[PDB]
Amino acid sequence: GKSFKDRKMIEKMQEENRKDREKAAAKFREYFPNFVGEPKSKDILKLRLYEMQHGKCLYSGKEINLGRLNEKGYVEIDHALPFSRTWDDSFNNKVLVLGSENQNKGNQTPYEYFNGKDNSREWQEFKARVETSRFPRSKKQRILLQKFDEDGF
Amino acid sequence: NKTYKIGKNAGYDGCGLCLAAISENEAIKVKYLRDICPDYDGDDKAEDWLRWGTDSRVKAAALEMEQYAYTSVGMASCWEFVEL
């Protein structure tokens, strides 16, 4: 039932994804030779987001120590927009943040937490941090969303 | 989809699919799928519980939690647990 073209793309995609997975794992091991066990998707993504965010906690702007990237409780991947209010589990909603800063934000959106409704200095600085990150434009847009319909939840 | 604050000693580790034990309207323990099943290599999307809810160590982890509290599959996000 499958086309010739679909067969060839399935084979090439499977091999390219195997190479990409293999290089990402070796790069992680290069920075963390003493990592105990096998790096998982969450660990690889922590390093990717660390790089996209220029090494800074997205909520506070504080420098994340790369040596401590895998330390217990130090930094976390979490959602910018709470899943309970958005059902948004996408990559565009994922950010790397200090655990203490993430706990302070809690179930607020960034627009609420940084007082975006008053165009506060904190909101302007957060937006500036998001805008200068190496996030795709649709990811920048997601993190800064102001308007939500929570009636479906 | 009831939502519960995740407690301070629950094992929070950022966003992710997880089991939660709920007591006095709070998630007192969470166990992430990625820890229960070290072979879940995915990206923590809600619809993945329709597949993963059947794995034996998920059932075993849930049964142990049920010995002390109401337990459900769901999503951890922004220090909340959402039942799925």
DSSP line for A73-136: TTEEEEESS-HHHH---SGGGEEEEEHHHHHHHTT--HHHHTTGGGT-HHHHHHHHHHHHSS--
Say which residue the tokens 């820890």 belong to: B35
CA–CA separation, A75 and A48 (whole Å): 13
Nearest to A88 by CA among A20, A152, A31: A152
Could you tell me the two tokens for A133? 């990150």
CA–CA separation, B30 and B17 (whole Å): 9
Nearest to A38 by CA among A49, A48, A23, A28: A28
CA–CA separation, A94 and A71 (whole Å): 19
Q: Which domain holds residue B12?
A: 2-84
Q: Strand A75-79 to strand B3-6: parallel, antiparallel, or no bridges (unpaired)?
A: unpaired
Residue A64 DSSP one-character state: P
Say which residue the tokens 């990625």 belong to: B34
Q: Do A84 and B46 touch (CB under 8 A)?
A: no
Experimental approach was X-ray
CA dist A139 to A92, A144, A145, B21, Å?
4, 9, 10, 32
CA closest to B83 among chain A residues? A84
CA closest to B33 among chain A residues? A42
Buried b vs exposed e over A62-91: b needs ≥16 C-beta within 10 Å? eebeeeebbeeeebbbbbbbbbbbbbbbee
How many CB pairs below 8 A link A and B? Answer: 63
CB atoms within 10 A of CB A46: 21
Provide, as residue numbers in chain A, all residues whose Cβ is less than 8 Å from the Cβ of B82: 83-84
Inter-axis angle of helices A4-31 and A41-52, to 10 degrees? 80
Could you tell me the two tokens for A45? 């993504």
CA–CA separation, A103 and A113 (whole Å): 12
Chain B CB within 8 Å of residue A102 CB: yes
Note the Cα A100 to chain centre separation in Å.
Answer: 17
Chain A CB within 8 Å of residue B48 CB: no
CA–CA separation, B34 and A8 (whole Å): 32
Provide, as residue numbers in chain A, all residues whose Cβ is less than 8 Å from the Cβ of B80: 82-84, 107
Nearest to A46 by CA among A2, A118, A97, A86: A97
Residue A37 DSSP one-character state: S
Q: Are A87 and B46 in contact (CB under 8 A)?
A: yes
Length of chain A in terms of residues written:
153
Could you tell me the two tokens for A108? 């607020």
Helix/strand/coil percentages in chain B, nearest 5: 25, 35, 35
Q: Do A78 and B78 touch (CB under 8 A)?
A: yes
CB atoms within 10 A of CB A14: 9
The resolution, in Å, is 1.6
Q: Strand B3-6 to strand B26-32: parallel, antiparallel, or no bridges (unpaired)?
A: parallel
CA–CA separation, A122 and A57 (whole Å): 14
As for how many domains chain B has, the answer is 1
CA–CA separation, B74 and A24 (whole Å): 29
Of A41, A99, A106, the CB nearest to B43: A41
Nearest to B77 by CA among A84, A31, A95, A3: A84
Radius of gyration of chain B (CA): 11
Say which residue the tokens 């993430």 belong to: A102
Radius of gyration of chain A (CA): 18
Q: Do B77 and A82 touch (CB under 8 A)?
A: yes
- Catalytic residue numbers of A read 79
